[PDB]
């Protein structure tokens, strides 16, 4: 897997597609 290069927001990691978490700004890395 891996995570985009996208700026997606969320509340949890659940919102975060591939690889990705959610960050403490409140976006997807």
């Given at each position: 897997?891996?995570?985009?290069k996208?700026?997606?927001?969320?509340?949890?990691?659940?919102?975060?597609?591939?690889?990705?978490?959610?960050?403490?700004?409140?976006?997807?890395?």
């Amino acid at each position: 897997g891996v995570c985009p290069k996208i700026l997606k927001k969320c509340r949890r990691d659940s919102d975060c597609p591939g690889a990705c978490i959610c960050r403490g700004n409140g976006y997807c890395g």
